[PDB]
A paper describes a structure:
[name] and LRRK2 have a similar domain organization: an N-terminal half containing Ankyrin (ANK) and Leucine Rich Repeats (LRR), and a catalytic C-terminal half containing the ROC–COR ROCO signature, followed by the kinase and a WD40 domain. Despite their shared domain architecture and involvement in intracellular trafficking, their disease associations are strikingly different: LRRK2 is involved in familial Parkinson’s disease while [name] is linked to bone diseases. [name] and LRRK2 use different mechanisms of autoinhibition, with [name] having a second level of autoinhibition absent in LRRK2.
We imaged full-length [name] in the presence of guanosine diphosphate (GDP). Each molecule in the dimer has the same conformation we observed in the monomer; however, the ANK domain is fully resolved in the dimer structure. Surprisingly, despite the similarities in their domain organization and the structures of the monomers, the [name] dimer bears no resemblance to that of LRRK2. While LRRK2 forms a parallel dimer mediated by a single homotypic interaction involving its COR-B domain, [name] forms an antiparallel dimer mediated by several homo- and heterotypic interactions. In contrast to LRRK2, whose dimer is mediated entirely by the COR-B domain in its RCKW moiety, the [name] dimer shows minimal direct interactions between RCKWs; the only contact seen in our structure is a homotypic interaction involving residues 1,263–1,265 in the kinase N-lobe. The main contact between the two [name] monomers, and the most striking feature of the dimer, involves the ANK domains; each ANK domain contacts the opposite molecule’s kinase on both its N- and C-lobes, effectively blocking access to the kinase.
Author numbering:
A (entry chain A): 51 to 244, 254 to 510, 539 to 620
B (entry chain B): 51 to 155
Write the structure that this text describes.
Amino acid sequence: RSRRTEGIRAAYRRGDRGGARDLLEEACDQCASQLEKGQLLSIPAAYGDLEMVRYLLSKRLVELPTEPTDDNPAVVAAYFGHTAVVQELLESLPGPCSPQRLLNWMLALACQRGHLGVVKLLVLTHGADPESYAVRKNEFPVIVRLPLYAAIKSGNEDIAIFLLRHGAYFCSYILLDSPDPSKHLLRKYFIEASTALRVKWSHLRLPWVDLDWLIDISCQITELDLSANCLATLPSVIPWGLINLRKLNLSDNHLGELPGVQSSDEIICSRLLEIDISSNKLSHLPPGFLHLSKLQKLTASKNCLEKLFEEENATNWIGLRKLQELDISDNKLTELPALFLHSFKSLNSLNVSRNNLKVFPDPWACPLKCCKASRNALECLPDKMAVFWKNHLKDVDFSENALKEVPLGLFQLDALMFLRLQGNQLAALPPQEKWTCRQLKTLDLSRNQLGVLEFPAFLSESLEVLCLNDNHLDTVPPSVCLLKSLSELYLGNNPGLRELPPELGQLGNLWQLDTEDLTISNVPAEIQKEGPK
Amino acid sequence: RSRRTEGIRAAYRRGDRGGARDLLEEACDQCASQLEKGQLLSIPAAYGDLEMVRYLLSKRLVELPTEPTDDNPAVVAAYFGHTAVVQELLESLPGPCSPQRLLNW
């Protein structure tokens, strides 16, 4: 019975493809069982006769088993690198549950064999996992069955780098077991030369890095992006042992602590211009940052910070003097001591929102163009805003806080035009005659205990949106009639209202109105149902 | 709580895509449950903002439910013919068992 197989094989062994066709048809008629038909389909696939595979799949309708074995026709097709036969067989697999197990098995087989095209088609077209194990039944998930490891250990560097560029990751075993080719790939295929290189080792899940990998080129730059991985520690050279770095991305990792310094003498990276250490597990920043006078951006948000810096209230700090951006939001800071904060001179953007802050930091003469401190427990704001930021601050977000009254200073500002002052307990404003926010475009004064609200007449040409929903409003303040230029208004969530003023019709620019759960006595039900227009 | 949705929708209703981004990030921080995140992903997909769908799938890592419902972000993406958004969402589906049921729907 098995002879039929050999006979067909004989026809292919001598190159007699037509005789192989005849013997194959005879066996298919005599091969009723699924295993025998699968073997018949394996014969030409192993040989490489794509045409006869097509005939068997199309006319004989031969089933393609999903067993991840070397007897499988697709496995042998991948074994010999016959990409056309592999795709032809894989197309015949029925049902939605694509048999990934077979795909990983043949993927690792191709990686071991060196058939790059088969690996490419499997991973890119059929979605075979480049980071799972090609493990069969009664087999263990050993790294030898992992396709990147099998590719690089086999000497198939091209397949390994292709896998890395198309979803594979490095791990401790790769670096420890094959450090030479691993460092070769790290030192070649992630380098953007510019000397002052730009090396992107991020998104590689590297559990550790070594000076041995690139410190030889620390003359100007070794690397810049080490984010998006599982790093838990660093050499101190990575912070400050490199000469002409300009940007470092040390974010999105397990770096709960960064190496520190004893003085500025230990810092060689005096040229750093931005640093990204967010999305880490930091409780405080190292004081070495307080020696980088040239650093222009620091972003240490998405951390567990309790303080910006340790209480070094004696040292002549010069660093961060020219810092423009400090983003330390999404942290657990209750106090922002005036020491380090007043050491700044060039800050313009301060993002300290989403913290446990209760007192806004004691202000100082520094040109803040924008400040976000919402999602805090802030009780009040300083009165020196108009002293320092009268001509600088444009965006303010002190909303969602425990604040009860905004002093006149915020509204005495001139450059201020973007106000988010909701989510507070404020119930009364400073008199409108004291307001100098001529450039005001958006005023979000919702979600508070405000009732009368007054506006400068100048805002007749300035405001584009005004939010006053969800307040203690029983009657619309008549001052709204001033705001001809207003385009969007909220008045909903005010159950005490019954009259909609006629003067709102004078506000020509209106296109939308929050009429949510507002019953208007002086408007018929039909007009209310039709909408704001 | 539902207001967040409408607020983001408002930003897209007037064409304010950056304001929609800000409101979307705020809601994502305040939307922990899978259904709320799926709704947040449905908003731009129904609108057609492929960029914000990409940001949600890549950065926020928003889960894509396999329920064959008109609330599904991919279903609404197919509803308005936004082919790019449909492929972007369908690429995010994990695992080997490709949810054919959603695909037929």
